[PDB]
Amino acid sequence: HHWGYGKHNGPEHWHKDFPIAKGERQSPVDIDTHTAKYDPSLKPLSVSYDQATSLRILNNGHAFNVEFDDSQDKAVLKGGPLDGTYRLIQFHFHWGSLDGQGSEHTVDKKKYAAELHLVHWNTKYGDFGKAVQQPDGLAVLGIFLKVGSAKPGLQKVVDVLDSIKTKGKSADFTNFDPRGLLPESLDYWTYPGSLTTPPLLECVTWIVLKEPISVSSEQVLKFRKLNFNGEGEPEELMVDNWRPAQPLKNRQIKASFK
Numbered sequence: 001h002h003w004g005y006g007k008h009n010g011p012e013h014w015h016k017d018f019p020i021a022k023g024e025r026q027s028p029v030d031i032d033t034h035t036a037k038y039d040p041s042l043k044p045l046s047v048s049y050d051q052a053t054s055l056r057i058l059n060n061g062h063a064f065n066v067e068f069d070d071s072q073d074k075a076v077l078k079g080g081p082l083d084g085t086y087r088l089i090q091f092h093f094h095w096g097s098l099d100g101q102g103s104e105h106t107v108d109k110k111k112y113a114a115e116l117h118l119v120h121w122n123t124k125y126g127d128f129g130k131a132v133q134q135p136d137g138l139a140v141l142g143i144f145l146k147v148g149s150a151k152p153g154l155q156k157v158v159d160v161l162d163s164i165k166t167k168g169k170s171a172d173f174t175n176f177d178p179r180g181l182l183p184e185s186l187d188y189w190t191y192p193g194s195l196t197t198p199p200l201l202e203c204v205t206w207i208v209l210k211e212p213i214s215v216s217s218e219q220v221l222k223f224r225k226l227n228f229n230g231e232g233e234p235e236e237l238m239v240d241n242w243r244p245a246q247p248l249k250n251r252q253i254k255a256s257f258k
């Protein structure tokens with residue numbers, strides 16, 4: 001009886017195995033755009049993905065992860081609210097059964113169809129597993145998806161999904177350029193939070209871009225054909241793999257923009 005996104009094992013249950021689910025810096029949150037304060041001291045973000053080395057795509061039973069070579073400083077996030085250098089390890093998405101839900105963060109209570117998470121770890125801690133035990137261990141770039149025009153840079157991801165339908169399947173996924181998933185503007189909100197999946201560790205500096213990317217209905221329909229189950233098991237479509245907004249508690253969301 002492992003955690004998941006069903007009636008019996010979904011987010012409202014996670015606190016039993018992971019009591020930090022009720023902690024003081026949980027994610028995601030609602031971003032109240034009127035209360036977020038412009039912080040003139042932040043920087044422009046530095047997203048340096050030219051030398052990114054994608055390796056593989058994995059259906060882990062909760063999402064699919066596009067994994068990178070993080071054995072050296074190839075694709076890194078720096079600047080913005082961050083001190084030091086954060087190495088890209090993987091990206092994945094959260095999405096809904098219909099276009100009116102799917103994102104984890106919300107903006108004035110608006111839910112987007114999906115949300116992309118580019119996960120990076122602080123190189124001062126040497127490895128990902130050490131990083132997640134630190135309050136400044138991870139930096140996650142969050143990007144909302146809305147349904148409209150196709151995203152050209154997403155189609156290579158869409159077209160491999162048939163090959164990783166079920167939990168535990170992987171495929172080679174070399175030479176994928178994550179720059180093709182970014183919006184034009186890097187304007188962002190930032191706040192201290194957590195992983196949005198068990199173990200829900202409070203180790204993340206969240207950087208949530210204001211500008212959504214557009215994907216087509218056909219693209220997100222292919223996400224929804226994935227399975228949470230393993231091969232041969234009763235089919236459970238991989239949809240609604242999002243955690244709802246958690247209490248903000250004693251946190252301030254800062255804006256990079258006026």
Ligand SMILES: [O][B]1([O])O[C][C]C2=[C][C]=[C][C]=C21
Pocket residue numbers: 117119140195196197198
């Ligand atoms: O799956 B997760 O919660 O979704 C948010 C992003 C993140 C970051 C590190 C590990 C897992 C996850």
Ligand SMILES: [Zn+2]
Pocket residue numbers: 092093094117196
């Ligand atoms: Zn995520």
